[PDB]
Design an enzyme around this catalytic site. Structure first.
Site, PDB file in Angstrom:
ATOM      1  CD  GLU A 114     -20.371 -30.376 -26.955  1.00  0.00           C
ATOM      2  OE1 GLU A 114     -20.028 -31.556 -27.149  1.00  0.00           O
ATOM      3  OE2 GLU A 114     -19.831 -29.667 -26.085  1.00  0.00           O
ATOM      4  N   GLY A 167     -19.708 -35.464 -36.340  1.00  0.00           N
ATOM      5  CA  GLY A 167     -20.104 -36.779 -35.903  1.00  0.00           C
ATOM      6  C   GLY A 167     -21.592 -37.014 -35.970  1.00  0.00           C
ATOM      7  CB  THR A 168     -24.452 -35.274 -34.455  1.00  0.00           C
ATOM      8  OG1 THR A 168     -23.741 -35.361 -33.230  1.00  0.00           O
ATOM      9  CG2 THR A 168     -25.871 -35.695 -34.169  1.00  0.00           C
ATOM     10  CG  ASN A 210     -19.664 -23.113 -45.061  1.00  0.00           C
ATOM     11  OD1 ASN A 210     -20.823 -22.913 -45.399  1.00  0.00           O
ATOM     12  ND2 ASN A 210     -19.330 -24.024 -44.169  1.00  0.00           N
ATOM     13  CD  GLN A 261     -20.736 -26.249 -33.125  1.00  0.00           C
ATOM     14  OE1 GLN A 261     -20.172 -27.300 -32.829  1.00  0.00           O
ATOM     15  NE2 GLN A 261     -20.579 -25.132 -32.433  1.00  0.00           N
ATOM     16  CG  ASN A 299     -26.069 -19.850 -40.309  1.00  0.00           C
ATOM     17  OD1 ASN A 299     -25.635 -20.736 -41.036  1.00  0.00           O
ATOM     18  ND2 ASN A 299     -25.933 -19.871 -38.994  1.00  0.00           N
ATOM     19  CD  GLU A 310     -44.461 -29.925 -60.187  1.00  0.00           C
ATOM     20  OE1 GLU A 310     -45.536 -29.474 -60.628  1.00  0.00           O
ATOM     21  OE2 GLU A 310     -43.707 -30.643 -60.879  1.00  0.00           O
ATOM     22  CB  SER A 313     -22.396 -30.379 -41.594  1.00  0.00           C
ATOM     23  OG  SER A 313     -22.493 -30.671 -40.218  1.00  0.00           O
TER      24      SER A 313
HETATM   25  N1  LIG Z   1     -22.428 -22.377 -43.650  1.00  0.00           N
HETATM   26  C1  LIG Z   1     -22.378 -22.835 -42.404  1.00  0.00           C
HETATM   27  N2  LIG Z   1     -21.497 -23.832 -42.071  1.00  0.00           N
HETATM   28  C2  LIG Z   1     -21.448 -24.302 -40.814  1.00  0.00           C
HETATM   29  C3  LIG Z   1     -22.293 -23.778 -39.860  1.00  0.00           C
HETATM   30  N3  LIG Z   1     -22.064 -24.406 -38.693  1.00  0.00           N
HETATM   31  C4  LIG Z   1     -21.085 -25.314 -38.898  1.00  0.00           C
HETATM   32  N4  LIG Z   1     -20.678 -25.256 -40.201  1.00  0.00           N
HETATM   33  C5  LIG Z   1     -19.660 -26.125 -40.814  1.00  0.00           C
HETATM   34  O1  LIG Z   1     -20.005 -27.409 -40.363  1.00  0.00           O
HETATM   35  C6  LIG Z   1     -18.909 -28.127 -39.868  1.00  0.00           C
HETATM   36  C7  LIG Z   1     -19.060 -28.204 -38.367  1.00  0.00           C
HETATM   37  O2  LIG Z   1     -19.016 -29.503 -37.837  1.00  0.00           O
HETATM   38  P1  LIG Z   1     -20.034 -29.748 -36.639  1.00  0.00           P
HETATM   39  O3  LIG Z   1     -21.429 -29.407 -37.045  1.00  0.00           O
HETATM   40  O4  LIG Z   1     -19.507 -28.983 -35.463  1.00  0.00           O
HETATM   41  O5  LIG Z   1     -20.063 -31.280 -36.249  1.00  0.00           O
HETATM   42  P2  LIG Z   1     -21.267 -31.697 -35.281  1.00  0.00           P
HETATM   43  O6  LIG Z   1     -22.530 -31.889 -36.077  1.00  0.00           O
HETATM   44  O7  LIG Z   1     -21.484 -30.671 -34.211  1.00  0.00           O
HETATM   45  O8  LIG Z   1     -20.777 -33.042 -34.556  1.00  0.00           O
HETATM   46  P3  LIG Z   1     -19.358 -33.124 -33.811  1.00  0.00           P
HETATM   47  O9  LIG Z   1     -18.427 -34.048 -34.547  1.00  0.00           O
HETATM   48  O10 LIG Z   1     -19.625 -33.663 -32.439  1.00  0.00           O
HETATM   49  O11 LIG Z   1     -18.738 -31.756 -33.724  1.00  0.00           O
HETATM   50  C8  LIG Z   1     -17.709 -27.289 -40.182  1.00  0.00           C
HETATM   51  O12 LIG Z   1     -17.230 -27.722 -41.423  1.00  0.00           O
HETATM   52  C9  LIG Z   1     -18.250 -25.893 -40.313  1.00  0.00           C
HETATM   53  O13 LIG Z   1     -17.457 -25.166 -41.224  1.00  0.00           O
HETATM   54  C10 LIG Z   1     -23.176 -22.784 -40.194  1.00  0.00           C
HETATM   55  O14 LIG Z   1     -23.917 -22.330 -39.340  1.00  0.00           O
HETATM   56  N5  LIG Z   1     -23.225 -22.309 -41.468  1.00  0.00           N
HETATM   57 MG   LIG Z   2     -22.565 -30.523 -31.030  1.00  0.00          MG
END
Ligand SMILES: Nc1nc2c(ncn2[C@@H]2O[C@H](COP(=O)(O)OP(=O)(O)OP(=O)(O)O)[C@@H](O)[C@H]2O)c(=O)[nH]1
Ligand SMILES: [Mg+2]
Ligand SMILES: Nc1nc2c(ncn2[C@@H]2O[C@H](COP(=O)(O)OP(=O)(O)O)[C@@H](O)[C@H]2O)c(=O)[nH]1
EC number: 3.6.5.-
Lengths: 426, 429, 49, 107, 36
Positions: free
Chosen positions: B63, B136-137, B198, B11, B220, B246, B132
């Site tokens: 998801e 989980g993923t 963030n 996500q 983003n 590089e 991130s």
């Molecule tokens: N800067 C920025 N941060 C993001 C963005 N999307 C998510 N985040 C951060 O990334 C983390 C989100 O966790 P998720 O990406 O939902 O976890 P996942 O990869 O979907 O896997 P799950 O555990 O199943 O939710 C949080 O700390 C958010 O603050 C984004 O588009 N931009």
């Molecule tokens: Mg997901």
């Protein structure tokens, strides 16, 4: 894709399962003939979590509604929303328990579980990847308090990985509906800790102390009180059904709320609660959904955590803003009331963002609070269960139904120690 | 022949892969149908005998309600149906869910589709991986991908650009255990590794632009403005070029130290930049002042030990070299003694492209510095301090053990961090 | 006054991916002024070896 | 003529049941349907034409509730003439519809 | 005396509930209709 198969039990279970399926039916736009006359097509994407499919555009729920006498399902079949449930899914007995655990735990309950355990395997197996089940009963009856604890103990053995939640109704501590209602409650709780994933706690003077004081009402029906515990009940499965920036579900909240499997006792709340004449006089903004939650009035348990510690604290937000101005209040509340959190966690407040608001509303929030304010809730059962059992009161209702006094004795020691397990973290 | 196959996981994968792949459709001449209404697209897009330009991307999530939206809305016919991979349940703020049990049935469909794009590219420069640690993923499956990426390709270039958690706020609770235990796998399995936070873009977007109350989309866009300057020289002509090989050559002196930073210079609004001169001196001053960085840690405690500069648009080599010679001399900035020169410059002719609906103006100059330092030893310090504050009570560990996992990963992933926390002052001295 | 009175707001039911990512206009596309011209094919190892 | 599914902020004036009001817009929360009070004959009356001055129930199509007159609480207006309207279907202990809910569309 | 404390707490619980309901909210509805 993901589904939720729904369990109800009794008179509490059917006068709450009649209104929860009213708010969901307004959410996805469902009229009482089944069909869909909604506006958008976000209202038809993830509808399969709760509704099945049939001939045409008919969507009949995944509902298991159970009692031991059909004088409760005669009403719910004959309400406005009584032609939406499939007629096979009510399960009714002949002679109910009626405020006794054992009658609906061994005598009448245990001979009735062999058809409820067929209506769940016909219907959990229809789902593709079922997330889990919900239950909503009361610990003060004999239908849900005895047999609903017997389906908890006998559905975790066939499907031992799928989720098990409970919107339980624990006793009201101040003014109570039934004398012997301690006996029904305290024997369910020991049966509840080992076979439930996460537990809410829904009291009825916890609802009275809101609607008296916050919505300014002087005719609060249960049909008003069942909105307050179905506004939250659909406020936990939001991000399955609607997208957002950051999502959640029933699995991801209990991940951050069960540090140990003896510790899943919450207390819920709900942000935008004002009167009808105090309605326009407040701007519906972000800090005014989080000044209300941490206050000592909004919660749906009748227990105040100023004495205790917020172990962990959840949040699930709605409306197209939870991104930076929620992150200066969740940073503010972790600093100002600095003695209401315990040290041994980095940070406690979890966050999700659903972007679609509830209908007729702009913004909202919902609370799931794992606390050390439930160990003052289970002590007012076992300060009245030991003010009853030394004089062996009402006991002939139980030893002649096949129980024994050590089973009464055991539910003392396994709930006196669970308070003594919670009591260190304060 | 200059391909850069992107990997985005989660996500944070798809909300970033939506913004990054929106810029390239307007950086080159791409309709959101995929067509066009002079060959720079060959890094990212691929051709057919009908004029269609399909990206070389993978979007991975566990998801469905994150990627069943990108295939629903505007940029729908652009992406191939099979390039976006979805699970059926989410790993739910965990490691073993992402790493062993659920990650083992999405490790196979991806590695068929990485191999299909990589067989199409002749001169494939290397993969890019954005994810991130907070999920989980993004933190369980992604370290599983790179544990099975090194056997298929070896010394092939794999860059990291992760969303580390913020030091003050964070979205979750058990999120350190995913953030700690990803680094035990992403040390031997990462070439270069950027960081963002963030909250360190929240304060920038409200201060350095007038747009307060943003979303992640307004965060983003600036993340996708770093990545354009990373692949800046590979598509458009330059006075001096850089390349994917590089960055790790001049920023990774030691293979246990591959942690640069990121900073973007001209972050000024569509009005406030329209009424002020923006010379090459006046953008290289921003990337050194400690209130403009894309992390929340000041290098005044630290030492800059390698650097890199990127440039766009209206740059002359004379004025580049006039303002470099100032910031060498000021004693708000100091280097370590063992890097004698400490720079790398790269100049791209093409000025950056304005995004409609963004928050930046038509500009002429830009800088994307990547300065690794010793002030990340105060980043693993805080991710440790709150990990042995909470491992002392075994506060969450039962979630992880019964999920195709054993207990002993936790007691070594901290002792792995202890060596790398001792590594960053031996090199730092 | 534009903040007080609302837009007609059929966007109450809106995912951010629909609002924040619409279709941009056909004319805001970048002209590639400084790009190596493709009329003469680039130097490529056309020996396939 | 409109009325929505009941919420926690949208209630009638004196009684707090489902409220009925007037609105400019067009939707499906505007469509009503009228049936017969004698409950063993409405499935035989599902397609018959409706006579003018006869007592017929009025119900909504989305809520399946019905429009009512509360002769028990008063609304002092400028015109001085008083009652309350809402939508809540009433039934007796014999489970037929009360005289509260009967409506007639006279010409 | 111990039972005096228990009885006092029980009566103030139920009595605070009944005051906060009736004698503090029926006057609220009467006040609002009187002012209208
Ligand atoms: N800067 C920025 N941060 C993001 C963005 N999307 C998510 N985040 C951060 O990334 C983390 C989100 O966790 P998720 O990406 O939902 O976890 P996942 O990869 O979907 O896997 P799950 O555990 O199943 O939710 C949080 O700390 C958010 O603050 C984004 O588009 N931009
Ligand atoms: Mg997901
Ligand atoms: N909040 C709420 N409480 C209810 C409802 N129906 C019954 N109760 C409470 O449940 C208790 C009696 O439940 P009971 O009839 O014994 O449940 P059952 O026998 O298991 O079906 C009383 O304290 C009621 O106040 C309801 O719809 N909502």
């Amino acid at each position: 894709m993901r589904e939720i198969v729904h369990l109800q039990a009794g008179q509490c279970g059917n006068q709450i399962g009649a209104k929860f399926w009213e708010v969901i039916s307004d959410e996805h736009g469902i009229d009482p003939t089944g069909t869909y006359h909604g506006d958008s097509d976000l209202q038809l994407e993830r509808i399969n979590v709760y509704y099945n499919e049939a001939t045409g555009g008919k969507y009949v729920p995944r509902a298991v509604l159970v009692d031991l006498e059909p004088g409760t399902m005669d009403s719910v079949r004959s309400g406005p929303f009584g032609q939406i449930f499939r007629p096979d899914n009510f399960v009714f007995g002949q002679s109910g328990a009626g405020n006794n655990w054992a009658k609906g735990h061994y005598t009448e309950g245990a001979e009735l579980v062999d058809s409820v355990l067929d209506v769940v395997r016909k219907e959990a197996e229809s789902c593709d990847c079922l997330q889990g089940f919900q239950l909503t009963h009361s610990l003060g009856g004999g239908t849900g308090s005895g047999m609903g604890t017997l389906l908890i103990s006998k559905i975790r053995e066939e499907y031992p990985d799928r989720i098990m939640n409970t919107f339980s109704v624990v006793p009201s501590p101040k003014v109570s509906d039934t004398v012997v209602e301690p006996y029904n409650a305290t024997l369910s709780v020991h049966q509840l800790v080992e076979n439930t994933d996460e537990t809410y706690c829904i009291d009825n003077e916890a609802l009275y102390d809101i609607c008296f004081r916050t919505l300014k009402l002087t005719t609060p029906t249960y049909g008003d009180l069942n909105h307050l515990v179905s506004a939250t009940m659909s406020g936990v499965t939001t991000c399955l059904r609607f997208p957002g920036q950051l999502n959640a579900d029933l699995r991801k909240l209990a991940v951050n709320m069960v540090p140990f499997p003896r510790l899943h006792f919450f207390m819920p709340g709900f942000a935008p609660l004002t009167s009808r004449g105090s309605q326009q006089y407040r701007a519906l903004t972000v800090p005014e959904l989080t000044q209300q939650m941490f206050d000592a009035k909004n919660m749906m348990a009748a227990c105040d955590p100023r004495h205790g510690r917020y172990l962990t604290v959840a949040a699930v937000f709605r409306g197209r803003m939870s991104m930076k101005e929620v992150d200066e209040q969740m940073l503010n509340v972790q600093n100002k009331n600095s003695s209401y959190f315990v040290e041994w966690i980095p940070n406690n407040v979890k966050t999700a963002v659903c972007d679609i608001p509830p209908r007729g509303l702009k913004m909202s929030a919902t609370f799931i609070g794992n606390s050390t304010a439930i160990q003052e809730l289970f002590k007012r059962i076992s300060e009245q269960f030991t003010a009853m059992f030394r004089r062996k009161a009402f006991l002939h209702w139980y030893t002649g139904e096949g129980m024994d006094e050590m089973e009464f004795t055991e539910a003392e020691s396994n709930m006196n120690d669970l308070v003594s397990e919670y009591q260190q973290y304060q | 022949m200059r391909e850069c196959i992107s990997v985005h996981v989660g996500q944070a994968g798809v909300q970033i892969g939506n913004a990054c792949w929106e810029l390239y459709c307007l950086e080159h001449g791409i309709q959101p149908d995929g067509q066009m209404p002079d060959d720079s697209f060959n890094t990212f897009f691929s051709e057919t005998g009908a004029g269609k330009h399909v990206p070389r991307a993978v979007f991975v999530d566990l998801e469905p309600t994150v990627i069943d939206e990108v295939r629903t809305g505007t940029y729908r016919q652009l992406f191939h149906p099979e390039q976006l991979i979805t699970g059926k349940e989410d790993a739910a703020n965990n490691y073993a869910r992402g790493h062993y049990t659920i990650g083992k049935e999405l490790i196979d469909l991806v590695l068929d589709r990485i191999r299909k794009l990589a067989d199409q590219c002749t001169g494939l420069q290397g993969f890019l991986i954005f994810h991130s640690f907070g999920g989980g993923t993004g933190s369980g499956f992604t370290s599983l991908l790179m544990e099975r990426l090194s056997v298929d390709y070896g010394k092939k270039s794999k860059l990291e650009f992760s969303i580390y958690p913020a030091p003050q706020v964070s979205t979750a609770v058990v999120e350190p255990y995913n953030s700690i235990l990803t680094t035990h796998t992403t040390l031997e399995h990462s070439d270069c590794a950027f960081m963002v936070d963030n909250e360190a873009i929240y304060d920038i977007c409200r201060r350095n632009l007038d747009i307060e109350r943003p979303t992640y989309t307004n965060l983003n866009r600036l993340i996708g403005q770093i990545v354009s300057s990373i692949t800046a020289s590979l598509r458009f002509d330059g006075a001096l070029n850089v390349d994917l090989t590089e960055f790790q050559t001049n920023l990774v002196p030691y293979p246990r130290i591959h942690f640069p930073l990121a900073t973007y210079a001209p972050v000024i609004s569509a009005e406030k930049a329209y009424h002020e001169q923006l010379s090459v001196a006046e953008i290289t001053n921003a990337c050194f002042e400690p209130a403009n960085q894309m992390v929340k840690c000041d290098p005044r405690h630290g030492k800059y030990m390698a650097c890199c500069l990127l440039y766009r648009g209206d740059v002359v080599p004379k004025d580049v070299n006039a303002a470099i010679a100032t910031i060498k001399t000021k004693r708000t900035i100091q280097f370590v003694d063992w890097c004698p020169t400490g720079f790398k410059v790269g100049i791209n002719y093409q000025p950056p492209t304005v995004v409609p609906g963004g928050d930046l103006a038509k500009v002429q100059r830009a800088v994307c510095m990547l300065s690794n330092t010793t002030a990340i030893a105060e980043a693993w310090a805080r991710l440790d301090h709150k990990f042995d504050l909470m491992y002392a009570k075994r506060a969450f560990v039962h979630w992880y053990v019964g999920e195709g996992m054993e207990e002993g990963e936790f007691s070594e992933a901290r002792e792995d961090m202890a060596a790398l926390e001792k590594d960053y002052e031996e090199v730092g001295m | 006054k534009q903040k007080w009175l609302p837009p007609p707001e059929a966007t109450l039911r809106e995912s951010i991916y629909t609002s924040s990512y619409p279709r941009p206009p056909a004319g805001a596309m970048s002209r590639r002024e400084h790009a190596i011209p493709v009329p003469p094919p680039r130097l490529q190892p056309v020996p396939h070896f | 003529l409109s009325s929505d599914h009941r919420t926690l902020l949208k209630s009638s004036k004196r009684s707090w049941l489902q409220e009925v009001f007037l609105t400019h817009e067009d939707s499906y929360l505007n469509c009503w349907q009228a049936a017969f009070p004698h409950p063993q004959l409405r499935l035989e009356y599902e397609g018959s034409p409706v006579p003018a001055n006869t007592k017929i129930l009025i119900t909504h199509c989305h809520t399946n509730r019905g429009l009512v007159a509360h002769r028990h609480l008063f609304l002092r207006t400028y015109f001085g003439q008083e009652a309350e309207v809402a939508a809540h279907t009433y039934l007796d202990s014999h489970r037929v519809e009360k005289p509260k809910n009967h409506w007639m569309l006279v010409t | 005396q111990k039972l005096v404390d228990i009885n006092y707490c029980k009566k103030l619980h139920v009595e605070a509930l009944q005051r906060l309901q009736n004698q503090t909210r029926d006057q609220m509805v009467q006040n609002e209709n009187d002012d209208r």
